Amino acid sequence: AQVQLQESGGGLVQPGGSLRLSCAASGFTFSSAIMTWVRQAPGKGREWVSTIGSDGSITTYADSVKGRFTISRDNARNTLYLQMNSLKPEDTAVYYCTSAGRRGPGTQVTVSS
C-alpha cells in the first residue's frame, strides 16, 4: 500500500483570519482510514492538531485548537479537510496529514499582523 497524501489550502493571513486546508488521498481505501492533522513549526516540537475516524463521526482535537478548528472529510472525493478560524500567530506552522505512518509534504500556514 503506497499511501499518497497531498495537502493544499495554506496561506499568509492576519490575526483572527481563516483558512480551509484540504488533503487529497490516493493509493489506499481512504473511506476505511483514520486521518490525522499534525503541525510543525521550525525550532518547535511536533504538535497533533486533530484526528477523524474513517466514517467521520468520531473527531478529537488538541486543547490549543478546540472551538477554533474543525476537521472533516468527504470519503466519496478522497479528501480530508481542516477548517481553521480565529487564527493566532502561534498557529503558524506546516500543517500535514498522516495515515498509517505515512505523511504528506504539508501546507504552510502563516499568521502575522
Place this chain on the structure above:
Amino acid sequence: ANFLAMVDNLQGDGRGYYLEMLIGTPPQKLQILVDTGSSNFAVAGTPHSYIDTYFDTERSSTYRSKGFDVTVKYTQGSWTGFVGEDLVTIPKGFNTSFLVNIATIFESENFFLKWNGILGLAYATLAKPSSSLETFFDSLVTQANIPNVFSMQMCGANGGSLVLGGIEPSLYKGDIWYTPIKEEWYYQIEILKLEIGGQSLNLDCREYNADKAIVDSGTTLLRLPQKVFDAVVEAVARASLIPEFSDGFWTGSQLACWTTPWSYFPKISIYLRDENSSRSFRITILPQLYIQPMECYRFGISPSTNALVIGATVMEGFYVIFDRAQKRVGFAASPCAEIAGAAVSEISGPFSTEDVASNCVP
C-alpha cells in the same frame, strides 16, 4: 507523557508481559500482551474459555465498525475478528484517550491458552489485512506528541515496564549499545556470532540471519534455526563438564531436576553489529536465563524453521530500546535481572568484526 508513571506498568512473567488498556466509552479494562513481533491491536470479542473478560463492542458508544473482518494465521494457531475503531486510554503513562484501530476476535484455534488481547508494536509492513491499517504505535506517536521510540524491560526471571515515547534512566545502569534495524517489519537485527562458554560456533554468519534474526517480546524462548540450535546444544553439552543432559531436555519433552550447580553451565553470548560496522557488542545470558525453573528446569532455547527469534529468554536480561526514529535497537543490562544475588545477564564491547563478512543478512 510521563515515563516514570510507566515504570512497573506490565504484569506477568511465565505466561507473557501484559499492559492494562482501557477501551471504549465508558472504558472496558483489558489485559493486553506486549508483542514486538506483530503489528495488530487485537482483543477478545466473545466469552471463550481461558479468558475472564472481553471487549464488548456493543457497550462502547464511541466504537465504529469498519465493515470488514481480518483473519490472522500462524504456524501453531490462528484467529478471525471484526476490524473497528475506538478510543483507548493507557492509565499508566497517559491521561488522554487516542483513536485507534482494533480487531475484535470472534473465533480462534490455539490462541487463548491472563491476557485477553495482543498489542502488536512492530512496523506497518506486518499489519493485516494490509499495511494501510494504521498500527497502535503509529496512532499513539502522532496523537500523543511522543517520540517514535519505545523501550521494554522484563523482570520475571516483578512484572516489567513498557515506556512508550522514550528511555527511562532508572531502568538501566551502564551504557546502551545500539544495533541497526536491517529491515523495518519485525525488529530485524544482524547477528554476527554465537559464543558458548568462550567458544564461537563454527558456522557461517548467514546461518544466524536465515530468513531473519528478530527481537520479539511475544515469543517465550530463544528460538534458533535447526542447524544453529544443534550447534548450541552440542556446545552447551561439551562445556557443561558434569554428566550429560537427556535428549528430552534439549527438545523440551523432559524436565531436568535437582534437590543446582550454576557454575557448571556456560554463558551464551550473541554478537550484534554496532552502528559502526567495524565494531560489534555482545549480549550475554547466564545459565539462570536459559535453564528456566518450572527444583525442576526446562531448556529456554528451542528450534525453529524460519527466523532466529530473540524472545523473552534473552529479553529478561536486558532493557531493550526500540528506537524506530533512528532505525536501531538499543540494549542495556537490566538491574532487575538478578537471581540469588547474581546478575544473570552481561553486556560488553567493543569487538572487531574484521573476521566476519560485511553483510551477514542474505
